Design a protein around this ligand. Structure first.
Ligand code: NVW
Ligand code: CA
Ligand code: ZN
Length: 345
């Protein structure tokens, strides 16, 4: 196929894609059967399922041309922040959009924006933190004044690529649509910057305290401000959903991010940086740092999300608690979480 699917596993892929609308889709199998084109292959599936191609007159050719281009701007050598992660965040956002509490809430344009935002949110990620780029006086850091450095970059590159030959998937939108989508996308990607987590969660907390549903139990959002707030927390949840997938999947994610963190530690050493060495793979405690990560970041976010969508996210929340318990059981320089927390300042 134009996708990279051999006639061999075209049945394998279709069977894996039967769970396109599920939390337990396995995005790794999708990349195996697509020749490492998971982002393009899953985005195509998502757009078909939602009938977004026809709603917005994005021809297949334009969509595939843009997606394929987008996906090549992810770096396959970066262990976690590659096209598989982006594939996963998009597939995950696709599911969160369809939870019954969010049944008919969002316009097609809002759905288009959320999922697009998920696909581009990490494009051209060099595999290092914002703070690394800051401390090295990276051109990117200078360009965005050390503020949401990479998040700004992802947005820049994701829009830039619309301009390549037959890559403008938004060309048949009206001016008004394009301006609304853009503003929403910008707002969701910047919302994936971790130093904004706590302020993000502090507003989601509020939203829940005065939430209303229809007689159908569909959450009620009557002005742009509310919808974009839900949308941006949705994307950030998606971004932080690894620990809520099946233990088998979660551990693969953790393995990947730890490789990327350690690979960052090697660059810090190599380049002789700021005397404050992070722990290496012998000296770190990865398990302890996970439980630290889930208690401090992941669970408080997911618990508040589950509140908003009561009881839609319960199986998610229970799987989170099971996984926290598994990492918990496996527990025996500046540590991972110490380095994480210190660099929020
Ligand atoms: C901590 C440094 C290295 C400075 N990095 C950052 O601030 C950027 C950053 C990038 C990704 C994460 N995302 C993740 N971060 C962690 C983690 C964070 C701090 C201490 C120990 C672990 N674990 C996981 C993830 S994940 O859900 O992606 C995969 C599953 C486990 C957090 C932060
Ligand atoms: Ca990011
Ligand atoms: Zn991400």
């Amino acid at each position: 196929s134009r996708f990279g699917v051999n006639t061999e596993n075209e049945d394998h892929l279709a069977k894996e894609l039967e769970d396109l609308n599920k939390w337990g889709l396995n995005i790794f199998n999708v990349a195996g059967y697509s020749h490492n084109r998971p982002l393009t292959c899953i985005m195509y599936a998502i757009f078909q399922e939602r009938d977004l191609l026809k709603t917005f007159r994005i021809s297949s050719d334009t969509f595939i041309t843009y997606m394929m281009t987008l996906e090549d701007h992810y770096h396959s050598d970066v262990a976690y922040h590659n096209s598989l992660h982006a594939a996963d965040v998009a597939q995950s956002t696709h599911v969160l959009l369809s939870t019954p509490a969010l049944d008919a809430v969002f316009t097609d344009l809002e759905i288009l924006a959320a999922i697009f935002a998920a696909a581009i949110h990490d494009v051209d990620h060099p595999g290092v933190s914002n703070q690394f780029l800051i401390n090295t006086n990276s051109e990117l850091a200078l360009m965005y004044n050390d503020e949401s450095v990479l998040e700004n970059h992802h947005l820049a590159v994701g829009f830039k690529l619309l301009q390549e030959e037959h890559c403008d998937i938004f060309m048949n939108l009206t001016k008004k649509q394009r301006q609304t989508l853009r503003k929403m996308v910008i707002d969701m990607v910047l919302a994936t910057d971790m130093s904004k987590h706590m302020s993000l969660l502090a507003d989601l907390k509020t939203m829940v305290e005065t939430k209303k549903v229809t007689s159908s139990g569909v959450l009620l959002l009557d002005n742009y401000t509310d919808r974009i707030q839900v949308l941006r927390n949705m994307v950030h949840c998606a971004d932080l959903s690894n620990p809520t997938k099946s233990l088998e999947l979660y551990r693969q994610w953790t393995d990947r991010i730890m490789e990327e963190f350690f690979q960052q530690g090697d660059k810090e050493r190599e380049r002789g940086m700021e005397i404050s060495p992070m722990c290496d793979k012998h000296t770190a405690s990865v398990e302890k740092s996970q439980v630290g990560f889930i208690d401090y970041i992941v669970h408080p976010l997911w618990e508040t999300w589950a509140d908003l969508v009561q009881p839609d996210a319960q199986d998610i929340l229970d799987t989170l608690e099971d996984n926290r318990n598994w990492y918990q059981s496996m527990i025996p320089c500046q540590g991972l979480m110490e380095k994480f927390q210190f660099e929020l300042t």
